[PDB]
Design brief:
The chain is α+β, with helices and mostly antiparallel strands. The protein has one domain: 2-Layer Sandwich (Beta-Lactamase). It has helices at residues 43-54, 59-62, 111-126, and strands spanning 23-26, 33-34, 64-65, 70-73, 83-85, 90-95, 99-105. It binds sodium ion (NA). InterPro entries: PFN, PFN_euk, PFN_sf, Profilin_CS.
Length: 130
Amino acid sequence: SWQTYVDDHLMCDIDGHRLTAAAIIGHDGSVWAQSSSFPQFKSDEVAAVMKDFDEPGSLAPTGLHLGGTKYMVIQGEPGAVIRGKKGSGGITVKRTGQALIIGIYDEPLTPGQCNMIVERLGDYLLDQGL
Ligand code: NA
């Protein structure tokens, strides 16, 4: 299930190019499911994420390092979304009521495109019980 909710949604052929590494995680790090090529985040990298969600910004200063790489926060619904970017590619963290969707991308996949996707599911699960 999670591995379809990810490999059939979180990693589709928009326009003509898949994403890079999707992953759905709990508000605690518990890795519900994730792409084969998703990066070993860190229970903390995650805790920070949660930190900013309650109080926007706080992450942004130091940036978001996770899956190893650091990202430059950008713009997102304070308490609901968070976007990060590193050159061509970047990341997005859709926060559900119990989980957090996540997408990683690199050229030629526009940040826009990523959004569309991570944010897509997020809507769903939210209004479905999570
Ligand atoms: Na949407």
